[PDB]
């Protein structure tokens, strides 16, 4: 009825045709040292079931909305579908990103960037780090933090959150919008 409390994740990014990757640990997300493995978490089975209600809408819809565009020859029917797909896709992004700014989420983002930039000092010039603050990478690192915080609680199965991203990427689903 409970669960081992440990989480590992890594945010990867390519900068100037060079890839840096930072891996992060659970105790780091809570800002402490070193690590205590002995502790466990009580599974939030109730909370999980709720977020599932969201999850099952997003994924099962996108799935059926995709098979819908195949069977639809009509162009007036199709222009509505791809609309609805992208529409709720951004709502998902808007949601996760919101979580990406949190006690953990922002603490998450700081760690990645810190370890990436320290990686950028050795390997070359740091001056490329300007790209991390560009519009898209900033939205990028945020979503990741969002999915990562959800996973490090009982709220997101890694298997379902990965399959959640595929939905977010199957439709381009980034309006850059200034």
């Amino acid at each position: 009825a409970s669960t081992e409390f440990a989480y590992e994740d890594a945010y990867s990014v390519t900068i100037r045709n060079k890839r840096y990757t930072a891996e992060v640990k659970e105790f780091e997300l809570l800002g402490l040292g070193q690590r205590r493995e002995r502790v466990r978490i009580l599974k939030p089975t109730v909370a999980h079931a709720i977020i599932q209600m969201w999850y099952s809408w997003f994924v099962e819809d996108d799935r059926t909305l995709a098979a819908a565009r195949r069977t639809s020859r009509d162009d007036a029917e199709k222009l509505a579908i791809d609309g609805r797909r992208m529409q709720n896709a951004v709502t998902l992004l808007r949601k996760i990103e919101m979580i990406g700014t949190t006690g953990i989420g922002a603490s998450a983002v700081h760690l990645a960037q810190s370890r990436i930039v320290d990686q950028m000092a050795g390997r070359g010039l740091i001056d490329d780090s300007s790209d991390l603050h560009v519009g898209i990478n900033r939205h990028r690192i945020r979503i990741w933090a969002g999915l990562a915080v959800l996973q490090m609680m009982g709220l997101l199965s890694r298997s379902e959150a990965e399959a959640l991203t595929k939905v977010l990427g199957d439709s381009n689903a980034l309006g850059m919008v200034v």
């Binding site: 040292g33 070193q34 002995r38 000092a121 001056d127």
Partner: protein
């Protein structure tokens, strides 16, 4: 016995720059003109040159001495941290006492 060239610090020793310590590794260094004052009278430092033997009594259960030792244990050689050292004691003490 650390030698360093005073002109260029970032080049000579990056590690001793205050610039490093607060987290600016960029070419930019601290701007010499800015605001507010202060004076430091005292500080917190450990002792140098001390090797001491501490007996543990019949009783007497000295609540500071143990808390002092725990630190010496985590310090004088690494065993995790003195934080992680305490919650180990709680689990032992619960499982036993």
């Amino acid at each position: 016995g650390f030698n360093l060239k005073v002109k260029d610090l970032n080049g000579s020793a990056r590690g001793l720059t205050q610039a490093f310590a607060i987290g600016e590794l960029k070419n930019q260094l601290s701007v010499g003109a800015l605001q507010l004052p202060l004076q430091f009278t005292r500080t917190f430092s450990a002792s140098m040159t001390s090797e001491l033997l501490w007996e543990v009594g019949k009783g007497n259960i000295d609540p500071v001495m143990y808390a002092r030792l725990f630190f010496q244990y985590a310090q004088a050689g690494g065993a995790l941290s003195v934080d992680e050292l305490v919650n180990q004691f709680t689990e032992y003490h619960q499982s036993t006492a």
